[PDB]
């Protein structure tokens, strides 16, 4: 293995650590407070960020977590009360949008909760290396 | 709204789009070459890496890809003849000869991916997600 083959490797190991290690515990913290997913609570917040509706394809090319069986996800949604059913464009019925807020609250100090011994200065190195890892991906 | 708030969002964002871009290209190519899921190939490499077996315990804590059901994965390699109850899982002779070409596949498929990031943005990166992880 070369130093490129083994820093490939290290690279994608560490994201998926750290990827996992707060998935799970933000996921599950999250229903417990608020009764919503991760994968639920990031629907949503592509609704709320788009108040005119989204599409199926347009929902589903928005979201950071990827599918849920994405119309499947938006199937348990329109079922628990917080996105509207009276092709199919997309809202939060307005209880699921005083939901998403509560939510979004409750996420933000989770995440930070989580985070909370990690350092300004490894996140922002963190992030800028990925932001240019991403870029030229294209 | 805080500095340190959007930054930690900021991270967040960056892990999950960079994870989603890399994962499904990775999965579905190293599927088609191998016949195996990154999950499956993910806890093969655990067991590969202690040849006596694991615990689902100890399986489930060391797997990277998040899983929301070992007994169910540890089954599927069964079947496929992968891995054996030794309860607790073992890599087979055949689960073994497999876990070595297919990490042949994995790397260049991941290096197909990554074919136009530098060096230093994966040192870089990588260095400061050890920071954040040893933190933690």
């Not at 083959?5 to 290290?10: P, W």
């Not at 229903?31 to 929902?59: C, I």
């Amino acid at each position: 293995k070369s130093d490129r083959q083994q820093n490939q490797t290290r690279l994608w190991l560490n994201i998926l650590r750290l990827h996992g290690l707060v998935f799970g515990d933000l996921n599950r913290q999250l229903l417990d407070e608020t009764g919503l997913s991760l994968a639920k609570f990031d629907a949503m917040a592509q609704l709320a960020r788009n108040p005119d509706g989204l599409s199926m394809g347009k929902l589903s090319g928005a979201l950071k977590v990827t599918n849920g069986n994405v119309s499947g996800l938006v199937n348990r949604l329109i079922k628990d009360g917080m996105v509207v059913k009276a092709s199919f464009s997309a809202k939060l019925t307005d209880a699921g949008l005083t939901t998403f807020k509560q939510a979004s609250e409750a996420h933000n100090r989770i995440l930070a909760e989580l985070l909370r011994a990690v350092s300004d200065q490894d996140m922002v190195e963190a992030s800028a290396a990925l932001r240019g890892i991403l870029e030229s991906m294209q």
